[PDB]
Every structure is written in C-alpha cells, then in structure tokens.
Design a protein around this ligand. Structure first.
Ligand SMILES: *Cc1c(COP(=O)(O)O)cnc(C)c1O
Ligand SMILES: *Cc1c(COP(=O)(O)O)cnc(C)c1O
Ligand SMILES: CC(=O)OC[C@H](N)C(=O)O
Ligand SMILES: OC[C@H]1O[C@H](O)[C@H](O)[C@@H]1O
Lengths: 313, 316
C-alpha cells in the first residue's frame, strides 16, 4: 500500500515482502545475468515471513481465526515457527510451537523470544513425536488450529500474489529462467504459476539435495507440472558457495541460498543460456546459521588464531 | 532507485533508506513513538552507513586508493562487520584488531567477510588493540585507520541520509530525537540535519548509568553493547544535545526482552536502551501529542549468544 522509504509502517508485519533484488557480480563469471531475490531481507530474515503473513491474514479474512481466541499450533523448528511466533504476538494470538528437544537451542530460543509456548518432544521420537503432540493439542482444544492446514492452502498462493509479481516488476518483465530449492514447494510453485499467467516462457528449475533427491516427501503445495528440470546439488557444493558469497558479493545466506546460487551458476555455464536472465532466491539470512556446519570450518579457523605478545605491540 | 521496481547493482547499494514503525503496544503514553529501523540494513545494523561513508568519502578525498589501501580498525562490534562487508565488495583488504577476549562469534563474522583478524592480549585491554592499530598505520604506508570515533565522515553520513529519511518518514513531524551514543555519529548527524531544516526538535543522548561519561561521571563496564565507549567521542557534538538520559543495563535488557513480544521488534541491548529512554521522555506532559523518534540500531539475532537472552569501546 505504501513506500516504506517514505512513510511509517503501522506494525512490523506491514514490512513483510517487497524485498530487494540484486545482481550477482564477482561470483558470476558466466555469460548469463543472475538476479538474486533477497528473501533474507524480510523482517524475521527469511522467505517464511510471507507464509506466516498469509496464514494470519487469509485465515482471519475467512473467519477461521479470531485474535485473543484462536490458538495457532505448528510442529516446526525452522523459520516457519519463528515467523508464526512473530506475527502471532503482534496480532495478539497465542502460538504453540512443537519441536523435538534435539533441535538447536538457538531456534528454540527464537520462538520463545516472541512469546510462543514451546512444547519440546523427546529426541527419541523425532519429528513423528512432535506431529503426534500437535494432533493431540489441536483435537482436544476447540479454539486450537493447525497452522499446517492453512499453510497448505495459502503457501503457493502468497508467492503467486507477492514474490512472483515483485520479480516481474523488478526485472522489468525479463525472466528467462527461475531457479529455486523446494522446501514446502510454495516459492517455486507460486512464482512459476505467476510467470505462466503473464505469458512468460521462463524455464523453471527445482533444486534439491543430491543426498535427499526425493523430487527426482513431495509436499502437497508443490506442483511438479510447472517444473522443467531438477538440479541436484551436494551439501559440499551448497556449503562452499555459501562460504564464498560473503567474500565475493557480500551476500550472507544459509545452506539453501548456497544451493540455489550454485545451481544458477551451473545453468548459466550452458552455451544456450548466454545473455539470458536467470533469477533465483536467497531464502534466509546467514546469521541464523553461524553455529551450524555451514560456517564451522571458519569457526575452527578463528578459534585457533594466535594472540600477539605484548612485545609485538 | 526504488528497490521494489529495479534490481540493485550491488549489496552496498541497499544500505540506508530503512523503514520506520510506530511503537504501539508498549507505548502507553500520550506521545507518538517512531522507531527508525537501522536493524534492517544489509548487515543488520546502523554501522552499514558508517562503513559506506568511510569507503565512499575516503575514496572521493583520495585518502584510499583501490587495490592499494588497507582499511584497519580496532573493533569487535558492528563497525568491524560492516567495514569487512563493504571492503570485500569494493576489493579492499580489511584488518580488524580486537582483544582475544571478545566474542568468538564476532571474530568469525569478520573472517566470513574475508577480513584479516589480529588478536591482542586481553591483559592490555582496548589500549592494546589501539596500540596495534597505531603500529599498523605507522609501519604500513598503505594502511588507513577507519578512525570511527573521530572521522568527519560519521556525522556527515547521518546528516545526509538518516536525518532526511526521518524527516521524510514523519512528514516533517519530529518533536524529539533520542539516540544512544556509541561513536555519536547518529545523534550528531541527525541533530545537524534537523537544525538545518529549522526543526526545533529536542535532542536526547542515551548512555549507560554504569558508564555515564557524557553526564560527567566515571567510565565503567556495562552490558549495553554498542554504546558507552567510556570516553566522549570526537564525533559527538555536545552543543547539539539538550539532555542526556541514563539507562541501566537492567532497564535496557528488560526492554529488549519485551519488545519482541509487545511489538515484534527484535533488537540488541542498545535498541532496548533507546526505547526505554524514549518511553521515559514520553511520560513528560510537554510530550503529549508530540512525535518522538528513536533508533533500533541492530537486529537481535547477533545477540542470541550474549547475556541479553573497560572493553566497551571494542563492542562498537
Ligand atoms: C522455506 C525455506 C526454503 C524453501 O522455500 P519453500 O517456499 O519452502 O519451498 C528453503 N530455505 C530456507 C532456509 C527456507 O526457510
Ligand atoms: C554503533 C552502535 C550504536 C551507536 O551508534 P553511533 O552512531 O555510533 O552513536 C548503537 N548500538 C549499536 C548496536 C551500535 O552498533
Ligand atoms: C528451513 C526452514 O527454516 O524452514 C523449514 C520449515 N519452516 C520447518 O518447519 O522446518
Ligand atoms: O539484512 C538485515 C537483517 O535484518 C533484517 O530484518 C533482515 O531480515 C536481515 O536478517
């Protein structure tokens, strides 16, 4: 509705989306143009802000939830939980996040910082244990709702309505290729739906881990008919790319950003892609992953640094 | 350019023009409180602007030469991160000097952006880091100190960008501006801009009750990372400031812990201090119906491993 550069936003959820895009510069040694959609710039530092926004906005417009009455419940340890907790507290909903006790204490802490009730389930039960706990909570409290049921309904839709149109505007209607990893499938499905709807013939590439190539579970949100090709990227390739992006381009992202950019660079090296514009997504900001395997090699390096003697000063 | 409608040339082109948000649930006063969200900069702090200014203005003055100059600073704080970030983008070597006792996470972040990290013995404190910087600049003809506490570029960037942004966002309704003083660049530059447009806003500096040097007190250790350097920075212009508000560590922390739940604001210690101060000012009868602007300097995620959830100058 408003330019955030020129106005005061009514609340933090009003600053979700309309994220910037940037050219890949130093790392792009190819003949193609690579455009990064910076979902890492959302208020809670990931693409999942848009999904959480959709859930609260659309469910309330359909009368499925009421602030101060409905309780939003989800099994997650990821950015979706953070974003649900964030928007929930702003809008005055109780939020219950269920996750195994074996997940990172940092992720646990982030949910609690936004006042979510965090229900921890035994490590020995895994994600199944968290899903079972959610089922019990939702079934037994008439005012509890499952976020996942709304996420499934609204996920691709929000990307068709926001992410896609933004990309189209930012590139001035120039997209030859779109590359994105599949988590929930929302981003790739909603963007590809949008691009099809505006008559854009862009080729659509899904990215998945070589170590878990299930697209090659399949989320209900994901629409395989919109995808032209699957690129598999190894953990090592994703990590190497994410470790280099800060130095080459000042881009600080997670594992998925590394995978997406690696995939884009592989596509860009194809002769037929010369001079084409390839768009991909940086899903999340890197700082959330500082304690993970993504940056552990750098952590080991700085841990071992020598200290100057007083005599060398 | 409008970022909503164009592709940026580089990440340093997305610095500044940050959003602003009303403080709503936490604000029980008769004043309007506007938060300038410096936490939304690309490297998640106000220091992106200072780093941008240093590289942009130093190059325009010929004080750095691309592919020759090496940028040096003694810092484990946001200034070092931002210097390393813009340095690597522009192709400058960056050397960050810090006491060995500063956070390993901050050390790691400098190195992620390709800065060289020099560690100084903790028994020498910040003096030891400053001495190492002086040795680098004296002995290395190509080395240039960022000089964050004294450089003219600091207040200048805030006079040119942060101030005009606040003026535009509030549509010329700024009755009060409240900001914690680290380098003093933000408050000085914003106050300079507001003065230049004939705005009679009252200007409030915030400092730790534990280290109230702007108030004429003694330096001391405190938890409010980003502010309270333990001396009066050269950048800071006391003549522009109407009052200094002291905030305790406990008050700053309490506020920063509540802001995420009340208003979805996820910030560090200094954002808590600023908001606490703004709310204290806002209770004054003369502030009824007035617009008070303060700053959220940095995003909260950088503080997850800290106490939030002297060495003070090194945390800037
Ligand atoms: C959500 C997410 C993705 C995938 O986006 P989808 O819309 O779920 O397909 C991958 N990376 C990160 C870090 C994200 O949070
Ligand atoms: C730099 C810093 C400030 C203070 O800003 P100055 O312009 O240096 O006075 C406050 N808090 C944080 C987190 C900082 O990094
Ligand atoms: C990877 C991420 O942060 O998101 C994944 C998803 N939000 C989950 O519940 O795991
Ligand atoms: O890039 C600046 C950081 O704070 C902002 O909120 C972004 O989401 C990101 O995590």
């Amino acid at each position: 509705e408003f330019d955030p550069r020129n106005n005061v936003a009514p609340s933090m959820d009003a600053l979700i989306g309309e994220t910037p895009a940037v050219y890949l510069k130093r790392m792009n040694d190819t003949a193609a143009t690579i455009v990064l959609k910076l979902e890492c710039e959302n208020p809670m530092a990931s693409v999942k802000d848009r999904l959480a926004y959709a859930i609260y906005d659309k469910a309330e417009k359909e009368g499925k939830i009421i602030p101060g009455k409905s309780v939003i419940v989800e099994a997650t340890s990821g950015n979706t939980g953070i974003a649900l907790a964030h928007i929930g507290t702003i809008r005055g909903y109780k939020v219950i996040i269920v996750m195994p006790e074996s997940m990172s204490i940092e992720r646990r802490c982030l949910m609690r910082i936004f006042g979510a009730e965090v229900i921890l389930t035994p490590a020995a039960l895994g994600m199944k244990g968290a899903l079972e706990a959610v089922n019990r909570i939702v079934s037994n409290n008439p005012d509890a709702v499952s976020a996942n049921q709304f996420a499934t309904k609204y996920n691709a839709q929000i990307h068709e309505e926001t992410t896609g149109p933004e990309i189209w505007r930012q590139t001035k209607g120039h997209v030859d290729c779109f590359v994105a990893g599949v988590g929930t499938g929302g981003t790739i499905t909603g963007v590809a739906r949008y691009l099809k709807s505006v008559g854009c013939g862009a080729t659509i590439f899904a990215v998945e881990p070589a170590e878990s190539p299930v697209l090659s579970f399949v989320p209900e949100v994901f629409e395989a008919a919109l995808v032209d090709e699957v690129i598999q990227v190894s953990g090592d390739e994703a990590i190497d790319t994410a470790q280099k992006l800060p130095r080459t381009d000042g881009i600080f992202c997670g594992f998925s950003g590394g995978a997406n950019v690696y995939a884009a660079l592989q596509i860009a090296k194809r002769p037929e892609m010369a001079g084409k514009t390839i768009v991909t997504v940086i899903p999340s900001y890197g700082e959330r992953y500082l304690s993970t395997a993504l940056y552990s090699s750098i952590k080991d390096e700085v841990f071992a640094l020598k200290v100057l003697s007083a005599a060398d000063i």
